[PDB]
Design an enzyme around this catalytic site. Sequence first.
Site, PDB file in Angstrom:
ATOM      1  N   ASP A 128       0.835  -1.391  -0.019  1.00  0.00           N
ATOM      2  CA  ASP A 128      -0.027  -0.118  -0.012  1.00  0.00           C
ATOM      3  C   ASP A 128       0.684   1.300  -0.188  1.00  0.00           C
ATOM      4  O   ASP A 128       1.595   1.521   1.046  1.00  0.00           O
ATOM      5  CB  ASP A 128      -0.929   0.172   1.316  1.00  0.00           C
ATOM      6  CG  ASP A 128      -1.790   0.980   1.742  1.00  0.00           C
ATOM      7  OD1 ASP A 128      -1.607   2.080   0.744  1.00  0.00           O
ATOM      8  OD2 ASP A 128      -2.325   1.243   2.577  1.00  0.00           O
ATOM      9  N   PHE A 129       0.927   2.011  -1.225  1.00  0.00           N
ATOM     10  CA  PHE A 129       1.990   3.057  -1.252  1.00  0.00           C
ATOM     11  C   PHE A 129       1.751   4.293  -0.506  1.00  0.00           C
ATOM     12  O   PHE A 129       2.577   5.205  -0.302  1.00  0.00           O
ATOM     13  CB  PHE A 129       1.928   3.420  -2.846  1.00  0.00           C
ATOM     14  CG  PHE A 129       0.480   4.361  -3.128  1.00  0.00           C
ATOM     15  CD1 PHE A 129       0.563   5.698  -2.795  1.00  0.00           C
ATOM     16  CD2 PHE A 129      -0.791   3.747  -3.994  1.00  0.00           C
ATOM     17  CE1 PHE A 129      -0.464   6.580  -3.100  1.00  0.00           C
ATOM     18  CE2 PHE A 129      -1.558   4.640  -4.263  1.00  0.00           C
ATOM     19  CZ  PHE A 129      -1.685   5.864  -3.646  1.00  0.00           C
ATOM     20  N   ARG A 130       0.447   4.010   0.472  1.00  0.00           N
ATOM     21  CA  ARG A 130       0.522   5.412   1.532  1.00  0.00           C
ATOM     22  C   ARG A 130       1.135   4.714   2.754  1.00  0.00           C
ATOM     23  O   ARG A 130       1.994   5.487   3.294  1.00  0.00           O
ATOM     24  CB  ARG A 130      -1.143   5.583   1.742  1.00  0.00           C
ATOM     25  CG  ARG A 130      -1.553   5.693   0.409  1.00  0.00           C
ATOM     26  CD  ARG A 130      -3.023   6.351   0.668  1.00  0.00           C
ATOM     27  NE  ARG A 130      -3.586   7.093  -0.701  1.00  0.00           N
ATOM     28  CZ  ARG A 130      -4.043   6.419  -1.660  1.00  0.00           C
ATOM     29  NH1 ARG A 130      -4.051   5.261  -1.808  1.00  0.00           N
ATOM     30  NH2 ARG A 130      -4.484   7.154  -2.794  1.00  0.00           N
ATOM     31  N   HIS A 190     -10.049   5.188  -8.523  1.00  0.00           N
ATOM     32  CA  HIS A 190      -8.822   6.003  -8.598  1.00  0.00           C
ATOM     33  C   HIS A 190      -8.110   5.518  -9.844  1.00  0.00           C
ATOM     34  O   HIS A 190      -6.856   5.626 -10.003  1.00  0.00           O
ATOM     35  CB  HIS A 190      -8.051   5.661  -7.266  1.00  0.00           C
ATOM     36  CG  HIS A 190      -8.545   6.134  -5.925  1.00  0.00           C
ATOM     37  ND1 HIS A 190      -8.153   5.588  -4.685  1.00  0.00           N
ATOM     38  CD2 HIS A 190      -9.537   6.851  -5.618  1.00  0.00           C
ATOM     39  CE1 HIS A 190      -8.858   6.067  -3.928  1.00  0.00           C
ATOM     40  NE2 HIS A 190      -9.644   7.029  -4.436  1.00  0.00           N
ATOM     41  N   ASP A 221      -4.066  -1.974  -9.372  1.00  0.00           N
ATOM     42  CA  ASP A 221      -3.184  -3.192  -9.767  1.00  0.00           C
ATOM     43  C   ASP A 221      -3.788  -3.959 -10.618  1.00  0.00           C
ATOM     44  O   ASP A 221      -3.106  -4.871 -10.858  1.00  0.00           O
ATOM     45  CB  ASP A 221      -3.044  -3.782  -8.427  1.00  0.00           C
ATOM     46  CG  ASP A 221      -4.360  -4.264  -7.343  1.00  0.00           C
ATOM     47  OD1 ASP A 221      -5.242  -4.587  -7.955  1.00  0.00           O
ATOM     48  OD2 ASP A 221      -4.047  -3.940  -6.166  1.00  0.00           O
TER      49      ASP A 221
HETATM   50  C1  LIG Z   1       0.130  -2.615 -13.214  1.00  0.00           C
HETATM   51  C2  LIG Z   1       0.618  -1.871 -12.240  1.00  0.00           C
HETATM   52  C3  LIG Z   1       1.907  -1.380 -12.409  1.00  0.00           C
HETATM   53  C4  LIG Z   1       2.384  -0.344 -11.454  1.00  0.00           C
HETATM   54  C5  LIG Z   1       3.775   0.274 -11.686  1.00  0.00           C
HETATM   55  N1  LIG Z   1       1.931  -0.572 -10.120  1.00  0.00           N
HETATM   56  C6  LIG Z   1       0.898  -1.302  -9.831  1.00  0.00           C
HETATM   57  S1  LIG Z   1       0.046  -1.481  -8.603  1.00  0.00           S
HETATM   58  C7  LIG Z   1       1.298  -0.450  -7.449  1.00  0.00           C
HETATM   59  C8  LIG Z   1       1.592   0.877  -7.383  1.00  0.00           C
HETATM   60  O1  LIG Z   1       1.440   1.471  -6.177  1.00  0.00           O
HETATM   61  N2  LIG Z   1       2.360   1.477  -8.400  1.00  0.00           N
HETATM   62  C9  LIG Z   1       2.582   2.910  -8.359  1.00  0.00           C
HETATM   63  N3  LIG Z   1       3.264   3.283  -9.331  1.00  0.00           N
HETATM   64  C10 LIG Z   1       3.209   4.691  -9.158  1.00  0.00           C
HETATM   65  C11 LIG Z   1       2.700   5.231  -8.071  1.00  0.00           C
HETATM   66  C12 LIG Z   1       2.527   6.566  -7.739  1.00  0.00           C
HETATM   67  C13 LIG Z   1       1.064   7.405  -7.715  1.00  0.00           C
HETATM   68  C14 LIG Z   1       1.157   8.455  -8.890  1.00  0.00           C
HETATM   69  C15 LIG Z   1      -0.080   8.903  -9.037  1.00  0.00           C
HETATM   70  C16 LIG Z   1      -1.249   8.760  -8.104  1.00  0.00           C
HETATM   71  C17 LIG Z   1      -1.116   7.914  -7.450  1.00  0.00           C
HETATM   72  C18 LIG Z   1       0.246   7.038  -7.129  1.00  0.00           C
HETATM   73  S2  LIG Z   1       2.010   4.051  -7.186  1.00  0.00           S
HETATM   74  N4  LIG Z   1       0.276  -2.108 -10.973  1.00  0.00           N
END
Ligand SMILES: Cc1cc(C)nc(SCC(=O)Nc2ncc(Cc3ccccc3)s2)n1
Length: 278
Positions: free
Chosen positions: A40-42, A116, A99
């Site tokens: 979870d990127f947060r 989102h 994802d």
């Molecule tokens: C198919 C696939 C590819 C990728 C890279 N990931 C994922 S799932 C994981 C994930 O969190 N990837 C992210 N890539 C960039 C991010 C930064 C962001 C930018 C703008 C708005 C919100 C967050 S967050 N699936």
Amino acid sequence: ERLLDELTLEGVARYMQSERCRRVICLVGAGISTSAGIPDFRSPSTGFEISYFKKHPEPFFALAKELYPGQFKPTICHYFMRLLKDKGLLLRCYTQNIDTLERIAGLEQEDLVEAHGTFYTSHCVSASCRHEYPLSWMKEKIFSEVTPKCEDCQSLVKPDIVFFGESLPARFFSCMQSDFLKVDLLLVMGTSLQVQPFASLISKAPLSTPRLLINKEKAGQSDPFLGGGMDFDSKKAYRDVAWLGECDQGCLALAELLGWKKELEDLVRREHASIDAQ
Ligand SMILES: Cc1cc(C)nc(SCC(=O)Nc2ncc(Cc3ccccc3)s2)n1
Ligand SMILES: [Zn+2]
């Protein structure tokens, strides 16, 4: 009186197999994909602007490369929702996730509101063009290090995720207005309900509609500092139930009550075997 006979997972199960429960909406967050190896990127334990992105795309695409999942293997929780679909119970799945695991698990476009957005498709950003590109294309660009440009017009191509500065997709608001007139049960899974306007969805349920939270921590209660919300534990509580733990464990427990445990195991092991084999 109330629709649940008790405010427990067992009471929800009984309600779901009663004639009163026809239409389930799932609200899901990053909690449902962490067991698939997608952090979870947060969450701080783990490791955004559109205007910035359009002028300097390279960092986002660097960061994208860094975070690109090693495999796309949905969870018990994702296949649980496919099971709701197969049994004619799923009205909609509203996801905060980007994802694509909902789609790999067999939820179709009609079933889904990617609140989102998603990586599943990408678009050229030029208004007069807007050429669409699939993830296979985008992945090749992210991995080959080449900043994605449109074959037709050479403008930047952006994954269909909602960046800060952008509004949520129109589909979110248009489905919300219809779906929540039709819902019998809200299944809220793996979300702390910290992001708006997604979190406002819980307040869109009819007053009678039971709301089951499956999450590592209790969430959705009213903020004593500011202020409807989830009420799990007061003497006024009548419809909200919290099951605290991992999302896969909570869905397994609920499937088991429903008599679906063998179907869910069979579905999961089959789909996992398929994904493992490439
Ligand atoms: C198919 C696939 C590819 C990728 C890279 N990931 C994922 S799932 C994981 C994930 O969190 N990837 C992210 N890539 C960039 C991010 C930064 C962001 C930018 C703008 C708005 C919100 C967050 S967050 N699936
Ligand atoms: Zn273009």
